Write a protein that binds this ligand. Structure first.
Ligand SMILES: Nc1ncnc2c1ncn2[C@@H]1O[C@H](CSCC[C@H](N)C(=O)O)[C@@H](O)[C@H]1O
Ligand SMILES: Nc1ncnc2c1ncn2[C@@H]1O[C@H](CSCC[C@H](N)C(=O)O)[C@@H](O)[C@H]1O
Lengths: 173, 225
């Protein structure tokens, strides 16, 4: 048996920090990554300018739009915490990470074989052209572990959402 | 052994090179397979270098499929949301997409025009995802017509089991996502009677589109297949 000792507002956050470092993308794609990523529990979205990313910046205006999307998706998903969407930085400026995951076509390691649900999370995804093998080395040097997303080619948007889902939705959090 | 080589240029990355030579003990003449996400081929070691060099014997066909049938049962969604779902499910590996007319789904049917576009989408997405197999997109059917399944996972808000705690990679997969309003209490139960195990996609309410993506990602891309 038991007894309702005290009602409370439901836990909506994932528990640990989840920073998604995503390469700038063509079209409007990024807006969509931000929204869905907000629903999937990301806490920080850090756009990256990389070797093959077409865009290399982002006006103050484009960034404000991405922030309204995050806020709007936050309310829809039932979250109180609004993920911080930041100004794009260089891939070299990627900080050292306690635990990081990078989607790479070559790896064999699955996310469930690598993930420690107790520590913070750093996730990296490349642009439509992908990361340059020197960028993945840089990433591995930062602490990001290369992980597989299957035997099919995924749009960058999907890879980011898929990678994130296996870390949040997949762990039931 | 399958080894990652970006471009199939005949030169292996220092990583794959060390692994094949240091661990698997490769020798000139040793035949192995190379790939990069677009192609696959039978290679023969030419020099251990490093970096190890090889010559391509015969171009191969990359393994693209999940390996088992993956059927997505998705509730009819408003607007063109199902175009997104279809695109993502094709690149994520669904083998068939089955729209369902549910208690809370706004649309209750789908015309020839919509089915055509979704089919056009499946075809394009299969091409862009590298697949040859094109997911079949069937006309909608009532929830009740969902058949008994060998392995079914239904994304339910009121669920607690993780996918990785139930998933059997060897059996075919049947997946179910509800419409914007979500599955009713009677429906989830019915789906559960059909062989579906309710599953959680986390603590936040997700759009039906994102749920299907998440659920599919966890069963395919996640298992590296
Ligand atoms: N099957 C897969 N496994 C792991 N990551 C993948 C993936 N498919 C796509 N991605 C992710 O999505 C990004 C964009 S895919 C871009 C094209 C790819 N670089 C190529 O050479 O064809 C990749 O850099 C990676 O971050
Ligand atoms: N956190 C979650 N866990 C499992 N399934 C979810 C989910 N979030 C969304 N879904 C899936 O996405 C569909 C649309 S969400 C529908 C609204 C939701 N039932 C509510 O009123 O709270 C749901 O039917 C379910 O199939």
């Amino acid at each position: 048996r038991y007894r309702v000792l005290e009602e409370r507002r439901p836990e909506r956050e994932v528990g640990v920090e989840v920073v998604l470092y995503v390469a700038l993308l063509k079209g409007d794609k990024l807006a969509e990554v931000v929204r869905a990523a907000t629903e999937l529990g990301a806490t920080r979205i850090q756009p990256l300018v990389t070797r093959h990313s077409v865009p290399k910046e982002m006006g103050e205006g484009k960034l404000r739009r991405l922030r309204a999307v995050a806020l709007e998706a936050a309310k829809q998903s039932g979250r109180v915490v609004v993920p911080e969407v930041l100004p794009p930085i260089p891939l070299k400026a990627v900080p050292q990470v306690a635990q990081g995951l990078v989607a790479h076509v070559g790896a064999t390691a699955r996310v469930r074989e690598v993930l420690d649900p107790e520590k913070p999370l750093a996730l990296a995804v490349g642009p439509e052209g992908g990361f340059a093998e020197e960028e993945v080395a840089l990433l591995e040097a930062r602490g990001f572990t290369p992980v597989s997303l299957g035997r099919r080619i995924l749009r960058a948007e999907t890879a980011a959402l898929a990678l994130l889902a296996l870390c949040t939705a997949g762990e039931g959090r």
